[PDB]
Amino acid sequence: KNRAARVRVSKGDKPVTYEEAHAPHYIAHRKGWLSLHTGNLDGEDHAAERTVEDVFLRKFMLGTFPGCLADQLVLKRRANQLEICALVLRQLPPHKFYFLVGYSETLLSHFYKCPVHLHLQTVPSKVVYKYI
Amino acid sequence: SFFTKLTADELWKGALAESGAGARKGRGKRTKKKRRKDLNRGQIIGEGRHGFLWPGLNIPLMRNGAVQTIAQRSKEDQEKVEADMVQQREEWDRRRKMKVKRERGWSGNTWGGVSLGPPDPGPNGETYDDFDTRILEVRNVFNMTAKEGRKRSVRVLVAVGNGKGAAGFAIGKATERADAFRKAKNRAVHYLHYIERYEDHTIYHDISLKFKRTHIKMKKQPRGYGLHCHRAIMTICRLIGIKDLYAKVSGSVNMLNLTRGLFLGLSRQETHQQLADKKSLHVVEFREECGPLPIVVASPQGALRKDPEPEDEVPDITLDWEDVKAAQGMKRSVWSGLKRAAT
Amino acid sequence: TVDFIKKQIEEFNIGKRHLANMMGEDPETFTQEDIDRAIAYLFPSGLFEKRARPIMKHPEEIFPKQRAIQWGEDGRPFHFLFYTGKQSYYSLMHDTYGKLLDVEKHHNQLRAKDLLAEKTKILKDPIGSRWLIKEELEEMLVEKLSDQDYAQFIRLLERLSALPCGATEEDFVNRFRRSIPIQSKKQLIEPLQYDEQGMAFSRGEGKRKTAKAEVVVYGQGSGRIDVNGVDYLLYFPVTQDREQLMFPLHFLDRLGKHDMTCAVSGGGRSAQAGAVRLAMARALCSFVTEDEVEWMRQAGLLTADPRVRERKKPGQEGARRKFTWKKR
Amino acid sequence: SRYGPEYKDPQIDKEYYRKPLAEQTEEEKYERDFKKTQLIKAAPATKTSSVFEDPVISKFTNMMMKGGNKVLARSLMTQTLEAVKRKQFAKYHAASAEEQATIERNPYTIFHQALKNCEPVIGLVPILKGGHFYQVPVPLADRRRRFLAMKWMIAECREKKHRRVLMPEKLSQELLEAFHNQGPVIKRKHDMHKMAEANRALAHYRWW
Amino acid sequence: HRFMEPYLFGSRLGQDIIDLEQTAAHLQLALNFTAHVAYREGIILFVSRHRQFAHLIETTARDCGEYAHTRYFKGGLLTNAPLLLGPGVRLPDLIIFLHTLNNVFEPHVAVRDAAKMNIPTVGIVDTNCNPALITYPVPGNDDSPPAVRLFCRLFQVAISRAKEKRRQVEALYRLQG
RNA sequence: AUGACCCACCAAUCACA
RNA sequence: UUCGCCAGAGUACUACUCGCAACUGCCUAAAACUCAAAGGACUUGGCGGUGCUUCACAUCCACCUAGAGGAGCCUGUUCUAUAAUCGAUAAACCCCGAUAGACCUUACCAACCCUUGCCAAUUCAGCCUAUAUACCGCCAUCUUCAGCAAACCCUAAAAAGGAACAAUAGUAAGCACAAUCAUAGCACAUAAAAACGUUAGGUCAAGGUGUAGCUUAUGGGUUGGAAAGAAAUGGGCUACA
Ligand SMILES: [Mg+2]
Ligand SMILES: [Mg+2]
Ligand SMILES: [Mg+2]
Ligand SMILES: [Mg+2]
Ligand SMILES: [Mg+2]
Ligand SMILES: [Mg+2]
Ligand SMILES: [Mg+2]
Ligand SMILES: [Mg+2]
Ligand SMILES: [Mg+2]
Ligand SMILES: [Mg+2]
Ligand SMILES: [Mg+2]
Ligand SMILES: [Mg+2]
Ligand SMILES: [Mg+2]
Ligand SMILES: [Mg+2]
Ligand SMILES: [Mg+2]
Ligand SMILES: [Mg+2]
Ligand SMILES: [Mg+2]
Ligand SMILES: [Mg+2]
Ligand SMILES: [Mg+2]
Ligand SMILES: [Mg+2]
Ligand SMILES: [Mg+2]
Ligand SMILES: [Mg+2]
Ligand SMILES: [Mg+2]
Ligand SMILES: [Mg+2]
Ligand SMILES: [Mg+2]
Ligand SMILES: [Mg+2]
Ligand SMILES: [Mg+2]
Ligand SMILES: [Mg+2]
Ligand SMILES: [Mg+2]
Ligand SMILES: [Mg+2]
Ligand SMILES: [Mg+2]
Ligand SMILES: [Mg+2]
Ligand SMILES: [Mg+2]
Ligand SMILES: [Mg+2]
């Protein structure tokens, strides 16, 4: 059987996001891409760099916002600037949320040598597509 | 080596090995047990062992109406903080290793006799808190399946009663023990018997029944003699509200047959009133302690007979060689006279 | 779930006002079409599944039909057939059978009075009339159905329509009529074209197997064919290919009467022969009668040949051919 | 099978479409053909409206073909027909008026007569009974017998010639020998008929 | 059927003759009950599985303002109500059987299941039917059209009369104050 | 024609003061 | 109402006795010892060189085409061989991890070297050490197979079963199949998809990990070596014109 990026059927109680509810053969058909950048187009360069950046960004954002991260990150790259769009549970007081917004934006702007935008969309609890 | 790391969920799923092939066919023992503990449980945002204090996270943003600068704790302060977190871990390990007490029904490892607590409220909002449920028998049962081979379903037999004379049993079956418990409760509420109780402690009259291969023999006791019976029957009796009885079971002791036969035999009871009405006579009780005094229990509503009952010099009744052997003192069994704990 | 639909329609109207405002259009003349263009522009999701694309539509179209409340506040069901568990379907059947009984009674009274005044409306066949599918019936009753249920119903309708038809009865069985769309396979004739004092030239375009052919035929000329600026005898050295070019002309007996020029690209020699054959056949349909067009279609001249190279598959050799399979 | 089951095969015959008015049942039939809105398969590259093409010559051509060569096989077919023609002209002009009335110069009728003479009447199928395989006489369908004829021809004229000898030569030789019934191909057909008589009792083993 | 013998007047040349004295005595009580149920505003279901009188019965119940199941009886219908019918439901306070059998000649499930449900049951039990689990059985002919029609009519009238008397005693109740 | 032995279901949580 | 029988299984229609035209006989009928069961009926599977129907669409037979098995080479296994890796290894390994080994890669062998020895800190780093029968991750396989499954309901008990459409107890959300999507128009075809489980199938050497092991060494470097064909065989390439 194909195990790739699949959430196996449970006893029927298992809450599932729209994201996790669709296997790899459904990309570009039903679910879209979690990253947007030019580097994978036909005549273009530095796909490798954008990829390693991507990975580090997911890992980093997951570690910087413990427990409040709802869905997988959305990374949009436009003309040297990267906008990170995130779905975030309401856990921390807005004080901590802003603290980490600024801290992260600054830190990654100085790390990757480009302007970093961070857009937080807050949601009460994980949005459920299926089962449950 | 940073990219070489993973999510905590992935790591626990990996280390626990629940989804393996050893778990399914029971290829490994149940005495081997390991658990998952959250490592984010006691941690706060901003806290590290370097000891920093961040204006938005660790400490309040404004002290004395001004903005607090980024600062670092003293060495000994961090020592006390780490001591506190360590004592927190040891506290949760102290909480985890303590096993809650399970009230034992009959035996330590048996589920029989155990109370499941009041059944679940019906769809109409109907609620029974007056009902208690006891487990009669839990049994692991198997079926051979084309793919899976042996397939294990638990089936439990459970009885409910309010203590007021209404009781009933039912059976339930599931892959999980919990599920079967629920099913059996909720199903049991639907089948209820009314069991008439003479003076609300004993039964009305001596019963003997052969149900299938089981023989139940129940004798009606006076007030002080508590529940001398097979343990299952004692349970069902405490649920019915029968406080004084003697019952011997012979032949196959198989549980289900025992309770079906039991409830049938108790359902077949004939009240003094029914007797009074079918014979059209006064049924009159003679206490031994009250002497010759003729207490009238039941009177035949409608027209009483002027005709006396035909007197049979010698009665024709089926007699159990056991009762006769008892009456004449030929039962010498070392097991019969034994002193036991309270009902 | 009624408050839900009320709210959804409120916010759909408000949102349609907003969308009409940002798109710079009259909020009154805004249609579903315009809504579609608007969201297609504002939220451009390339996704191959069209049901996974952004949608703002009226809540009645988006949400599924709801079974209404089946009883009053006292508990008594509204419909008398409620306890059947299918009230809609069995109501339908009750009324259908009631009307079949009605037809039988009325028509028997007319048998006793020496009158058969009715006619058979049972043949709608030129209208292309058919019954509902089970899906349509299922949607009409807002209730799930079984194959035997639908078959039962339809059979009873056949019983009804096979008798003398009343007006109310005809109107009744005509809810359950659908009309199959236009059935004609007749081709669309290329209007003949007159160019620069030259008369009667027609065009056609064949496509076969990586090979495209554009063919212009003149009915005013003698027999010859020029393919990519050269003679057909030069361009197609193989006899088979010249026979392929000869097929439609010989079929219509036009073999000496027409003069053709062609542009054919890609594929091999036989693929080109076929593409030009098809193009030529489609080009000669302007010069001929409407019957011989049907004759060419029935000889297989006018249909493109769908047969095309299949993709090689991984783990195999030839898209069919498999690697050598070892038993032991 | 890029065509659904809906698609009918094309009728390539011109004579059928040209002269419809004299037949009622066939008028009704092809009326039902096109008016049914019936899809038609695109006519094959091999088949033409040509007055000069024999389906049997085309089948034999295909059956000669190795690899993907229609060109080389059509070549050898053409050359064999031409070789039979000229062999019969050489036999014609060296003869006398009687034998000039008798001898056939049509390579087409010689082809068809050679193959009709070379086709077997009866055949053999192996049947398993009691753990033994018995060769049993089986009546054959037409197409099977035509096939066997052609395949036997090509088998022999491929196999038994000297390597110097060209194909149209050997094939024309054997076409003219099988026209006159004296060829080794007809000897093969006779081996078949003799092996079919030797086993004739075993014809009871056949259950169909 | 063995339990039908106390209701038989006798057997005339192989045919069984139901005693109509007992039939009247029973039908009296049956109609009495049925009307009293309709008066107190409760649900009456006409159940028969016979395909002759199916339409007639559906018609009858529609005209009494009562409910009819004449079709294939779905398995868990009375026992498991909330799943088949809906989230919460009321169940018929009386069920009337014009035919106590199903077309395979076994007892109609709804008898056993209405018993199971604590619902009282009135039914017309023919010579071969089982009366045991039926609350108010009326012994009589269920096969011939005038008998079925007679009973249809009778129950129709009892229902209608009950509902009317309810209306009128209600009007009297409203004029009392 | 044949195909060591051995394989299986008898333990309970999490969260808060 | 009587009579005859029966007190776990084997040992045992046996040994020893009595009687008997039986003398390899019948009849009568134990014990030592061994075992913790032996038995009777059923249930659901699986299986059947069991029967009856219906099929197979590259598929069994009948039949079509081209190949393999013989030759040379190429490449992989198995053996033998080396101081000198590992993994796959019925179907479901065998141009397989490798869309790739002259050094490197590289894990192996022989010599030599280095012991807070990649990192911000750490009585710590590091380990291609053992266990794929602790696992996650990816898959193979049945399989283009149609089932799996929660929640209920029924059964003179239920291990389990649950359909009859002129319908007899079944309703069921969900997941698969189906439908849509892709192969730039349909259609077909192809691709993709294919649940739950099965084979403790494959992989601790992708990486990560449980448990158990090494720590001036089972760790980190440098230099140079890794041969070979008695034999057997798989898959290919080129042919025999
Ligand atoms: Mg204990
Ligand atoms: Mg090929
Ligand atoms: Mg009857
Ligand atoms: Mg042996
Ligand atoms: Mg064995
Ligand atoms: Mg013994
Ligand atoms: Mg004997
Ligand atoms: Mg003996
Ligand atoms: Mg002895
Ligand atoms: Mg094959
Ligand atoms: Mg070759
Ligand atoms: Mg070979
Ligand atoms: Mg070879
Ligand atoms: Mg190897
Ligand atoms: Mg290893
Ligand atoms: Mg190995
Ligand atoms: Mg294997
Ligand atoms: Mg090396
Ligand atoms: Mg090493
Ligand atoms: Mg494994
Ligand atoms: Mg299905
Ligand atoms: Mg049973
Ligand atoms: Mg079941
Ligand atoms: Mg379902
Ligand atoms: Mg498509
Ligand atoms: Mg398709
Ligand atoms: Mg596939
Ligand atoms: Mg699919
Ligand atoms: Mg293994
Ligand atoms: Mg291995
Ligand atoms: Mg490792
Ligand atoms: Mg080296
Ligand atoms: Mg080799
Ligand atoms: Mg290979």
What is the number of other CB atoms lying within 10 angstroms of the CB of residue B305?
11
Q: Specify the residue for token string 């059976």.
A: B171
φ and ψ of A29, to 5 deg: -105, -60
Report yes or no: A30 at the C interface, CB cutoff 8 Å.
yes
Chains touching D by CB (3 or more pairs below 8 Å): C
Quote the tokens at residue B195.
């069991």
- Contact present, C211 and C264 (Cβ < 8 Å): yes
C-alpha to C-alpha distance for C61 and C64, rounded to whole angstroms = 7
**Cβ of residue E79 lies below 7 Å from strand G:** yes
> Strand G: which residues 129-168 of C lie within 7 A (CB)?
144, 146, 148-149, 151-152
DSSP, collapsed to helix, strand or coil, labels residue C162 as coil
Contacts of C30 (CB under 8 A, 6+ apart): C16, C19, C20
- The residue in chain A having the minimum alpha-carbon distance to the alpha carbon of residue B44 is A66
Return the closest-CA partner of residue E63 out of E157, E148, E145: E157
**DSSP reduced 3-state for C304:** coil
Method used to solve the structure: cryo-EM
Q: Which residues surround ligand 3, an ion (CB under 5 A)?
A: E 126, 142-143
> DSSP labels for chain D?
--S-TTPBPP---HHHHH-GGG-HHHHHHHHHHHHTT--BPPPPSS--S-TT--HHHHHHHHHH--TT-SHHHHHHHHHHHHHHHHHHHHHHHTS-HHHHHH----HHHHHHHHHHHHS-SEEEEEEEETTEEEEEEEE--HHHHHHHHHHHHHHHHHHSS-TTS-HHHHHHHHHHHHHTT-SHHHHHHHHHHHHHHHTGGGGGS---
How far, in Å, CA of C79 to CA of C77, rounded? 6
Q: Cβ distance B263 to B235 under 8 Å?
A: no
H or E element: which one contains C77? none
Concatenated DSSP letters for B274-312?
A: HHHHHHTS-EEEE-STTTT-EEEEE--SSPPPSSPPP--
Q: Which two tokens stand for residue D41?
A: 């398969």
Residues of chain A with C-beta less than 8 angstroms from the C-beta of C52:
29-31
* Preferred mutation among B9, B45, B59, B61 to probe A, highest tally of A CBs within 10 A: B45
| Residue C210 near residue C271 (C-beta atoms within 8 A) | yes
Say yes or no: Cβ of B27 under 7 A from any atom of strand F.
Answer: yes
Q: Cβ distance C71 to E90 under 8 Å?
A: yes
Residue E10 neighbours by CB under 8 Å, 6+ apart: E16, E17
The verdict on C43 touching E (C-beta cutoff 8 Å) is: no
Strands B193-194 and C177-179: unpaired
Residues 53-72 of C with CB under 8 A from E: 70-71
Distance from CA of B41 to the nearest CA of A (A): 11
Burial environment of residue C110 by CB neighbours within 10 A (0 to 12, 13 to 18, 19 or more): middle
**Bridge pairing between strands C198-208 and C193-195:** antiparallel
Residues B108-120 as b/e (b if ≥16 CB within 10 A, e otherwise) read: eeebbbbebebbe
Beta-sheet pairing, E15-18 with D132-139: unpaired
Phi-psi domain of B305 (left: phi exceeds 0; alpha: psi -120 through 50; beta: other)? beta
Q: At what angle do helices C147-161 and C87-112 cross, to 10 degrees?
A: 20
Dihedral sign for Cα B48, B53, B55, B57, please.
Answer: positive
Chain G nucleotides close to protein (CB under 7 A) are 43-46, 61-67, 90-94, 126, 133-142, 149-155, 157-162, 165-175, 180-183, 185-201, 207-210, 234-236, 241
**Burial code of D70-81, b = ≥16 C-beta within 10 A, e = fewer?**
beebbbbbebbb
Let me know if domain B114-194 sits in CATH 3.30.450.20: no
CA C100, chain centre distance (Å): 35
A25 at C interface, C-beta within 8 A: no
B279 CA: distance to closest CA in chain E (Å):
25
**What distances in angstroms separate CA B292 from CA A7, B284, B286, B309, C96, one per listed residue?**
82, 11, 7, 20, 81
Contact present, B305 and B280 (Cβ < 8 Å):
yes
Q: How far is the CA of B148 from the centre of ligand 17 (A)?
A: 21
Distances from the Cα of C320 to the Cαs of C308, C313, D65, D66, D142, in angstroms? 14, 8, 21, 20, 31
Residues forming a β-bridge with D122: D139
Structure tokens that stand for B167 in this block? 């009781």
E151 CB burial (10 A radius; 0-12, 13-18, 19+): buried
CB contact at 8 A, C26 and C20 = yes
User: Is the CB atom of residue A132 positioned under 7 angstroms from any atom of strand G?
Assistant: no
Return d(Cα E114, Cα C83) in angstroms, integer. 13
Q: Which stretch of DSSP H or E encloses residue A77?
A: strand A74-78
The DSSP letter of residue B25 is: T
Please say whether the beta carbons of D17 and C277 come within 8 A. Answer: no
* Minimum CA–C1' distance nucleotide for B38: F14
Strand partners, E120: none
Q: Are strands B246-251 and B228-229 parallel, antiparallel or unpaired?
A: parallel
DSSP string, A84-117: EEEEEES-S-HHHHHHHHHHHHHHHHHHHTS-EE
Which residues of chain C neighbour D38 with C-beta distances below 8 Å? 185
Nearest CA in chain A to C45: A32
Neighbours of E9 (CB within 10 A): 14
Q: Indicate the burial class of B255 (C-beta count within 10 angstroms; 0-12, 13-18, 19 or more).
A: middle
With H, G, I as helix, E, B as strand and everything else as coil, classify residue B215.
strand
Token pair for B169? 């049993």
Q: In 10 A of CB A108, how many CB atoms?
A: 23
Give the CA C328 to C1' G143 distance in Å.
21
CA of C311 to the centre of ligand 27 (A): 14
Cα distances from A65 to residues A47, A83, A98, B4, C8, in angstroms, run 27, 17, 12, 20, 35
- Which residue shows structure tokens 């809609």? C88
Asked if the C-beta of B55 comes within 8 angstroms of chain A's C-beta atoms, the answer is yes
DSSP A130: B
Whether C76 sits inside 8 A of E62 (CB atoms) is no
Calculate the angstrom distance between C1' of G93 and CA of C328.
10
Is E67 within 8 Å of E92 (Cβ atoms)?
Answer: yes
Q: After which residues is chain A broken (C to N over 2.5 A)?
A: none
Sequence-ordered alpha helix ranges (H) in chain C: 2-22, 32-42, 59-62, 87-112, 134-140, 147-161, 167-173, 232-235, 239-252, 269-283, 290-298
Over the Cα atoms of chain E, what is R_g?
17
Total number of domains constituting chain E: 1
Domain span at E4? 1-177
| Binding site per annotation, positions of E for Mg(2+) | 126, 142-143
C144 CA to G213 C1' in angstroms comes to 65
- Both tokens of residue D31? 């009326």
* C224-259 per-residue burial string, b: 16 or more CB within 10 A, e: under 16: ebbbeeeebeebbeeebbbbbbbbbbbbbebeeebb
Q: How far is the CA of D30 from the C1' of G55 (A)?
A: 36
Question: Can you state the angle between helices C290-298 and C239-252, rounded to 10 degrees?
Answer: 140
Resolution (A): 3.2
Q: Confirm if C245 and C273 have CB atoms less than 8 A apart.
A: yes
Residue E145, token pair as written in the block = 């059209």
Residue C307 CB partners (closer than 8 Å, separation 6+): C209, D2
Nucleotide nearest to B102 (CA to C1'): F12
Instruction: Write b or e for each residue in C150-164: b if 16 or more Cβ atoms lie within 10 A of its Cβ, otherwise e.
Output: beebeebbeebbebb
Distance CA C170, CA D143 (A): 56
| D92 Cα to chain C: minimum distance (Å) | 30
DSSP 3-state of B245 = coil
Question: Alpha-carbon dihedral of residues D66, D69, D70, D76, nearest 10 degrees?
Answer: -70
Burial of B257 per CB tally in 10 Å (0-12, 13-18, 19+): middle
Question: D157-188 burial by CB neighbour count: b if 16+ within 10 A, else e?
Answer: beeebeeeeebbbbbbbbbbbbbeeebebbeb
List the 114-173 stretch of B: residues with Cβ below 8 A of E: 123-124
| Residues of C with Cβ-Cβ distance to E45 under 8 angstroms | 83
Cβ neighbours, 10 Å, residue B245: 23
Q: Do the Cβ atoms of C98 and C106 come closer than 8 Å?
A: no
Q: Are D80 and D158 in contact (CB under 8 A)?
A: no
Of the candidates C245, C310, C300, the one whose C-alpha atom is nearest the C-alpha of residue C272 is C245
